[PDB]
């Protein structure tokens, strides 16, 4: 089983500097050797065989090379330590002992399984023991997707492999927003190509002026032209030098691992477009194709060893109502301070298909029922996604209460219907669940067998029952004017808008015309009774012959409102065709969480994502971490573990890079665990003294130097600048970590890579927030609205563990006000923020710096309001030295939030920002600089309102994840108030202006208080 902590021994976080290891020699002798904590196995084995000569039967000892060490890990597996570089502390031992054996069997397979097992967080041997045939089928079958993807990787042998590792980071469309085309000089951009002349790295410049829509090969041609121009060549020779050397080189972003491999226009690449809008000069490095391909390993894909007349009727035949016997339950923990009963119900996802029947109330101490339950539903009327939800409950009719629950799929993954006796282990009811049934909870039996086990018997028929194939469904399915005004009005309604019985029947009646409006499919599917084969079969034929829709609209058909596989398969088929790899990376947070809803392990969605992950390493990288971060959860453990196994077995050589990341995080988790536990009541000095001493140790320096940042694996983390590393003030004990950038030309980009490792707080909320903020910025930018947001990187790697990208040269408003500028000591007042900004942007820099603030502030001001993250204070708002505003630490706000107040929200920092937007000016309440700022917010607020459906669907998909602020749709409904979707388009803007005016005037009056944020007013 996955080990609980990241300690070195079971129970002990850190080995003492000297450990007594009981070594089991291969002659049968046990000798106790005092090993150093950081000693490698090579040194331990060497000093062992020297001490072993003192003990009997030492003449039998062969050469040290002919033996390997074996021990038991904290996972309780027998790990054969083939890699003898690994240190004693990094072995994850249960108890300190080592066994000297001679290797048996296949060395390669042994290594790969431990590499995969370490990447997942659980050994592969556990999957081999799972007898569940669905699990073993998924494991065997899913390798088809792995081989398909590997064949595409090795299709264009050298180049396609480089595209896999270094996919072109580009925007979805080459079209340039109106304000971005204006920034470049009449259709062309200035670009600098660099060349490394010798191994003793020095550089040569080649400043070019190129059309923005040039392809990387054309950019190289212009660099060659500039060099060959200065040399004695004829027009034909200059022409030939370009032709014959265009395709021998390759471009790369100076200071990170981002390559221009594909023939996209240069402006479509994100680095260049970012350079264009910011006004920075792109610096690209000239590289040889023969140099990049030399670093590509050429990894192989080898199949593992787990890839090795019955009477049957159809379901469209059997005539009877659903009947289920509740045999007996093993035990129920009750106090005899209260009789108990079993409540059941047949559900189609969230919606129940029929009435919920109960069992007879039986004594508290005797748990037996043995009664055929008769549900109010017809068996052939069942859909494909029909499933049983039941639970054991108790009564004080006076006071009902559930104890243990459990859901089952009424149909197997084979399309077989349940038949006969079945034992089901139940799950415990979550902390915040008062419902008698838990219908949307995870489907299946509890792996933990030491829980209440309720047994039941299903109706056995003559033969084996199976759901009919689609061809049989088409047979049963076989059997105007102008009402187009309503269909096009409810199609543009947000998904959280109510659909009345008038409109549901009106949609079902006019469904054959709805094909002409394909975006109304989500509304139409809700307007169907899923307990009627008549209607279900007619929808099935419509779905298959349904026009493809936008991928943003198709993503809605994968949340908890559409459990039908034909509905999901359509959405996956839409994604397979139309969704770009860019938008895939954008919406990966939702797409991974959506996997949880799918009934079975093997399905169309996992096969789509896994192939794309095995085809694009930037997708696969975050696909890995998003899955691994949910391995702590038992409810998802099995599926995500099996899916991670599929990726790790096929991803290739990046598996080793991921292991280096895992090992690096494991070190950080354990180090923080010590600071949070054990060394809890120690001062900052002592813990920093411990940090410096412990980080300096060779096991830590080796583990956390020379690996790729999980926040962005294009950024390489070199050596630690330990002088900068420190523990942050927060009681959760975060780790500030600084790294040298080992890129050959880090000078021209990231000089320092700084990351915040925090162990304690849940970062899932920040991830989703920063994602939506990024999407909001994208929508504004494509509409020619320049509002510069800063969605800094954030990635959760486990249960309340993750990383945070550090923004350089940024300070909180609180930090800004601490300086003073030699105006006393700490004394400040509103104007100081502006004075600080002017004192650090002088000259003509000032004018552009003020512009950056207003644009960035307007974006966040609008965004925060729509989302409810507006009531922020000096500590949670940051300003860069150039003058870019951005809010931080969104999870802290969500943790600190009945339903009757909020009618008035005073923003005290309105006054401080108005002085920044408009220089000085005693009466800055209304200026020309302010009138511009307001219009920017108006344009933005309405722009998000136009794309409101996207954000609603984005949150709706994030309901599978167990977030306390995202459980029901009532939580998401808040956006409808801020955006005012029911109100008129013009009225919504009039509403917005009122909300802002109230917050402004409220800020003037209120007295803030600096530390505790308590308003005296």
């Amino acid at each position: 089983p996955p080990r609980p902590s990241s300690g070195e021994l079971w129970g002990i976080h850190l080995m003492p500097p000297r450990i007594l290891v009981e070594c089991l020699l291969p002659n049968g002798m046990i000798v106790t050797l005092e090993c150093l904590r950081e000693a490698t196995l090579i040194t331990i084995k060497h000093e062992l065989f020297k001490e072993a000569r003192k003990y009997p039967l030492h003449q039998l000892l062969q050469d040290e090379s002919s033996y390997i060490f074996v021990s038991v890990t904290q996972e309780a597996e027998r790990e054969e330590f083939f890699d003898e570089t690994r240190r004693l502390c990094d072995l994850r031992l249960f108890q300190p002992f080592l066994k000297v054996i001679e290797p048996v069997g296949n060395r390669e397979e042994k290594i790969l399984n431990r590499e995969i097992g370490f990447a997942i967080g659980m050994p592969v041997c556990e999957f081999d023991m799972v007898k569940d045939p669905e699990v073993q089928d998924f494991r065997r079958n899913i390798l088809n997707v792995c081989k398909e993807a590997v064949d595409l990787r090795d299709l264009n042998s050298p180049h396609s492999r480089a595209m896999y590792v270094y996919p072109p980071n580009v925007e979805s469309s080459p079209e340039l927003p109106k304000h971005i085309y204006n920034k470049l000089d009449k259709g062309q951009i200035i670009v600098v190509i660099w060349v490394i002349v010798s191994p003793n790295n020095d550089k040569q410049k080649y400043t070019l002026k190129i059309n923005h829509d040039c392809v990387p090969e054309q950019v190289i041609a212009e660099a060659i032209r500039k060099k060959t121009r200065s040399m004695l060549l004829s027009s034909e020779q200059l022409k030939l030098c370009v032709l014959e050397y265009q395709g021998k080189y390759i471009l790369k972003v100076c200071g990170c691992d981002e390559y221009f491999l594909e023939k996209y226009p240069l402006s479509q690449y994100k680095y260049i477009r970012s350079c264009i809008m910011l006004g920075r000069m792109p610096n690209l490095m000239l590289m040889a194709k023969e140099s990049l391909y030399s670093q590509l390993p050429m990894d192989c894909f080898t199949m593992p060893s787990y890839s090795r007349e019955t009477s049957t009727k159809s379901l469209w035949v059997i005539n009877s109502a659903l009947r289920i016997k509740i045999l007996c339950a093993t035990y129920v923990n009750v106090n005899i301070r209260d009789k108990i009963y079993v409540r059941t119900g047949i559900y189609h996802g969230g919606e129940p298909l029929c009435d919920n029947v109960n069992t007879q109330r039986v004594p508290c101490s005797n748990p037996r029922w043995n009664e055929w339950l008769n549900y109010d539903i017809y068996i052939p009327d069942l859909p494909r996604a029909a499933r049983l939800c039941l639970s054991i409950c108790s009564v004080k009719k006076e006071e009902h209460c559930p104890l243990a629950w459990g859901n089952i799929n009424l149909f197997d993954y084979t399309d077989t219907l349940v038949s006969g006796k079945m034992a089901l282990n139940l799950w415990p009811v979550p902390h915040g669940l008062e419902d008698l049934l838990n219908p949307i909870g995870v489907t299946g039996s509890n792996p933990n067998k030491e829980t209440p086990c309720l047994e039941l018997e299903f109706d056995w028929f003559s033969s084996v029952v199976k759901f009919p194939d689609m061809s049989v469904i088409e047979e049963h399915a076989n059997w105007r004017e102008n009402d187009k005004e309503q269909l096009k009005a409810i199609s543009t309604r947000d998904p959280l808008s109510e659909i009345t019985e008038q409109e549901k029947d009106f949609l079902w009646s006019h469904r054959h015309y709805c094909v002409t409006i394909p975006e109304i499919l989500p509304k139409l599917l809700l307007s169907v009774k899923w307990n009627s084969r008549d209607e279900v079969a007619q929808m099935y034929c419509l779905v298959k012959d349904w026009p493809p829709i936008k991928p943003e609209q198709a993503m809605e058909l994968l949340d908890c409102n559409y459990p039908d596989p034909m509905v999901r398969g359509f959405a996956v088929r839409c994604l397979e065709k139309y969704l770009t790899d860019d938008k895939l990376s954008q919406y990966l947070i939702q797409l991974v969480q959506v996997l949880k809803y799918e009934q079975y392990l093997d399905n169309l969605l996992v096969r789509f994502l896994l192939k794309k992950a095995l085809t694009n390493q930037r997708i696969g990288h975050f696909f890995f971490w998003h899955l691994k971060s949910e391995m702590h959860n038992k409810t998802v453990s099995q599926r995500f573990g099996l899916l991670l196994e599929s990726y790790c077995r096929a991803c290739g050589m990046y598996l080793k890079h991921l292991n280096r990341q895992v090992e690096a995080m494991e070190k950080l988790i354990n180090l923080t665990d010590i600071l949070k536990q054990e060394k809890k009541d120690e001062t900052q000095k002592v813990q920093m003294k411990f940090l410096v001493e412990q980080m300096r140790r060779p096991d830590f320096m080796d583990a956390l130097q020379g690996f790729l940042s999980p926040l962005n694996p294009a950024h390489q983390l070199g050596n630690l600048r330990l002088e900068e590393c420190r523990i942050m003030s927060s009681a959760k004990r975060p780790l500030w970590l600084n790294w040298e950038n080992p890129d050959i030309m880090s000078e021209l980009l990231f000089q320092n890579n700084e990351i915040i490792f925090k162990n304690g707080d849940d970062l899932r909320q920040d991830m989703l927030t920063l994602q939506i903020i990024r999407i909001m910025e994208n929508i504004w930018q494509n509409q020619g609205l320049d509002l510069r947001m800063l969605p800094y990187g954030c990635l959760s790697i486990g249960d309340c563990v993750g990383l945070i990208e550090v923004v350089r040269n940024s300070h909180t408003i609180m930090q800004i006000q601490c300086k003073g500028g030699l105006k006393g000591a700490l004394q400040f007042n509103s104007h100081t923020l502006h004075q600080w900004l002017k004192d650090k942007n002088k000259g003509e820099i000032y004018d552009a710096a003020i512009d950056l603030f207003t644009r960035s502030c307007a974006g966040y001001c609008v965004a925060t309001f729509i989302l409810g993250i507006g009531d922020r204070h000096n500590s949670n708002i940051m300003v860069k030295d150039d003058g870019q505003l951005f809010h931080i630490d969104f999870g802290h706000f969500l943790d600190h939030k009945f339903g009757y107040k909020r009618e008035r929200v005073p923003f005290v920092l309105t006054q401080d920002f108005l002085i920044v937007i408009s220089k000085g000016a005693q009466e800055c309440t209304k200026t020309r600089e302010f009138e511009r700022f307001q219009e920017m917010c108006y344009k933005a607020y309405l722009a998000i309102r136009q794309h409101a459906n996207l954000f609603i669907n984005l949150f709706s998909m994030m309901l599978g994840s167990g977030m306390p602020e995202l459980q029901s749709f009532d939580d998401i409904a808040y956006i409808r108030k801020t955006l005012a979707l029911d109100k008129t388009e013009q009225e919504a803007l009039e509403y917005f202006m009122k909300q802002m005016n109230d917050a402004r005037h409220g800020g003037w009056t209120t007295k803030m208080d600096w530390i505790f944020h308590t308003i005296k007013q």
Binding site: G28, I30, L57, V72, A76, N333, R337, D338, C401, Q502
Partner: protein, 239 residues
């Protein structure tokens, strides 16, 4: 049939305080609402359905042909597969008194805290039980290795002991036996340690259930105290 009487007529309250007013109910429990106008809430098929009533021409009706001209005489027709409505949800059910229910909210908090303290020691025990289960499996795999070591000792040492015997070097066999005893003594220490952990496992698994018992005893009270901290509207700030 009046504009407002307070029998099955609330305002245009949200869809959050509607589903929760007929959740786990029979084919009834209905109330009146408004829409983006009139709205009627229904329940049939085990589901929560919603119907709109167009009030144009100063008249009412569900189906296409307009068949009424008042609000409360539209219910009476369908009241007695358009299934009937059964029982309505009242507006009169549990002298300037918001202070006695201050004792039910004090109880709610005093039941939330005690339940949260129990849920804390439920998760803490649940984790520690799973920890001990794996630790036994590690001890078991450890013993299997140490027993496979004894076989390797008896296998290799035979030819050397069956040679020091034919030589009289007794205090050389003693060295071999002294080590084999150390190996066997360590196995007994591991087995004795694993047996003690099995005692701590089942003694905690019993205490684990006692926590679950008290939680299942307290849980019904918390769910019913949720209804008894109800608030009246339009009155600002209360403790």
């Amino acid at each position: 049939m009046s504009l407002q009487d307070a029998e099955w007529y609330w305002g245009d309250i949200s869809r959050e305080e509607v589903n929760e007013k007929l959740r786990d109910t029979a084919d009834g429990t209905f109330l009146v609402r408004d829409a983006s106008d009139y709205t009627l809430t229904l329940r049939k098929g085990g589901n929560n359905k919603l119907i709109k009533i167009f009030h144009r021409d100063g008249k009412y009706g569900f189906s296409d042909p307009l068949t009424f001209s008042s609000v409360v005489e539209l219910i009476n027709h369908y009241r007695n597969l358009d299934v009937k409505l059964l029982y309505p949800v009242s507006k009169y059910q549990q002298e300037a008194v918001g202070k006695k229910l201050h004792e039910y909210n004090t109880q709610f908090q005093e039941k939330s805290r005690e339940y949260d303290r129990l849920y804390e020691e439920y998760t803490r025990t649940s984790q520690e039980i799973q920890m001990k289960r794996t630790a036994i499996e590690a001890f078991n795999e450890t013993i299997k290795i140490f027993e496979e070591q004894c076989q390797t000792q008896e296998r290799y040492s035979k030819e050397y002991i069956e040679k020091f015997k034919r030589e009289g070097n007794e205090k050389e066999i003693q060295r071999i036996m002294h080590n084999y005893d150390k190996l066997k003594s360590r196995i007994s220490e591991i087995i004795d340690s694993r047996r003690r952990l099995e005692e701590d496992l089942k003694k905690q698994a019993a205490e684990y259930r006692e926590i679950d018992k008290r939680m299942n005893s307290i849980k019904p009270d918390l769910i019913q105290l949720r209804k008894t901290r109800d608030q009246y509207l339009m009155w600002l700030t209360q403790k």
